[PDB]
């Protein structure tokens, strides 16, 4: 289900998309896929919205079985983009579209890549071919008010605020990860290992964590503990009936103990209009890998492109 806001029913294809400053306001926008609509408008000359009637909870995932999507509060890359935690970059030509997802008819798809996050949009009136590589005309998208059907998120991914690590420990992890995957030559066009000869690229479903340096750390064997840190980001605030609280209202709730809430929120922030509650999510994920513990920015199991030693 949704985090705060029930799915959007839009009318004005041409309605502006406001920059809302409250955190719960931004989560509300994320619930209604307004961030992805914003993305399409900005990058691929698209009028209107995606997410009609379904919102974020009806988005399409590759793989279709999504563990992290059953947790309404786990942040997808796109969600993280809207919260300024990372950038889902507009695809360049050299960005690789992985095979396997049912791209046909999609209007937007994103995937974690080895060195970032890439998103692919189609203009107004167009959608993707099966290969994902071309935007061709589609009369079913004429409405400009398109169902969540048309949004594709690749990967079992959770993003979250990160405890930045020094370059030293990133280099150690990058090296550890190189020795775990000695036969990988490049991932998503990035040199992973030095290779003399190299296979044709092929899909690669790999576990990875983003620890905020030049590229991700793909992992063979790792352990994950989820910890509920009950920080302010873990709570959303809403007025009864009328959706999310104001930026100002949310702030005083989370800093002054003057609003109503559920039992965890009252414990950490205080309680005596707005109500704040725990978002449904397992917590922040801590990764043990390379004999290190680390709080990554994103964590996931996603498809990328790899070549192998020949």
């Amino acid at each position: 289900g949704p985090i705060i806001c029930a799915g959007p029913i839009h009318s004005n294809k041409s309605a502006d998309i406001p920059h809302l400053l409250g955190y719960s306001e931004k989560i509300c926008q994320i619930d209604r896929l307004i961030h992805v609509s914003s993305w399409l408008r900005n990058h691929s000359q698209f009028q209107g919205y995606v997410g009609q009637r379904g919102g974020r909870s009806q988005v399409s995932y590759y793989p279709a079985e999504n563990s992290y999507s059953r947790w309404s509060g786990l942040l997808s890359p796109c969600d993280a983009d809207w919260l300024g935690m990372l950038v889902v970059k507009k695809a360049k030509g050299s960005d690789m579209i992985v095979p396997g997802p049912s791209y046909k008819g999609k209007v937007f798809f994103e995937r974690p890549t080895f060195d970032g996050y890439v998103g692919w949009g189609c203009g107004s009136g167009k959608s993707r071919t099966e290969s994902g590589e071309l935007c061709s005309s589609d009369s079913g998208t004429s409405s400009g008010l398109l169902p969540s059907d048309r949004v594709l998120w690749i990967g079992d991914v959770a993003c979250q605020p990160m405890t930045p690590i020094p370059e030293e420990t990133f280099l150690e992890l990058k090296s550890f990860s190189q020795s775990e995957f000695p036969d990988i030559c490049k991932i998503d066009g990035i040199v992973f290992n030095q290779c003399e000869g190299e296979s044709l690229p092929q899909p690669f479903d790999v576990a990875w964590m983003d620890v905020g340096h030049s590229h991700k750390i793909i992992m063979r064997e790792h352990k994950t503990k989820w910890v509920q840190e009950s920080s302010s980001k873990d709570f959303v605030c809403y007025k009864e009936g009328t959706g999310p609280c104001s930026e100002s209202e949310e702030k005083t709730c989370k800093t002054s103990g003057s609003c109503r809430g559920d039992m965890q929120f009252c414990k950490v922030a205080g309680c005596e209009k707005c109500r704040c509650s725990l978002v449904h999510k397992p917590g922040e994920v801590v990764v043990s890998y390379g004999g290190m513990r680390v709080r990554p920015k994103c964590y996931g199991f996603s498809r990328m492109m790899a070549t192998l030693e020949v």
Epitope: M96, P99, E130, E133, L200
Partner: nanobody
Framework: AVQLVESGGGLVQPGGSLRLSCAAS????????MRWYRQAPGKERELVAL?????????EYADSVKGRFTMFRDNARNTVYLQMDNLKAEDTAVYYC???????WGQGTQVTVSS
């Protein structure tokens, strides 16, 4: 080493036809996914047609060229083709042949359409 050699570009009057070939070395196109790009001067590299082994051999075309260009392969000959019919001035470009997800590009062949 992978090699891609293109052929078949040239001068053609509007309405004319050309067949572009891409002979490949160092992989078998019967498993590869192949793409045809074109690059006009000033404009950006635009993807024009695909043959996707990942899709069982299916074929996909950009909207501008749909219905005039035809991509196909000769597995025996390890060669992929782009048949271009009813050529327009806007088809003038250098055409490139590329292996999907790789920096394997053909030399490029020049297609010029003019009356």
């Amino acid at each position: 080493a992978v090699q891609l050699v293109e052929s078949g570009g040239g001068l053609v009057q509007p309405g004319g036809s050309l067949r572009l070939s891409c002979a490949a070395s160092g992989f078998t196109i019967s498993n590869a996914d192949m793409r045809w790009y074109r690059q006009a001067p000033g404009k950006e590299r635009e993807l024009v047609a695909l043959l996707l082994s990942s899709l069982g051999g299916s074929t996909e075309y950009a909207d501008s060229v749909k219905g005039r260009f035809t991509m196909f392969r000769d597995n025996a000959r390890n060669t992929v083709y782009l048949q271009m019919d009813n050529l327009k001035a806007e088809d003038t470009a250098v055409y490139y042949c590329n292996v999907r997800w790789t920096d394997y590009w053909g030399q490029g062949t020049q297609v010029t359409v003019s009356s």
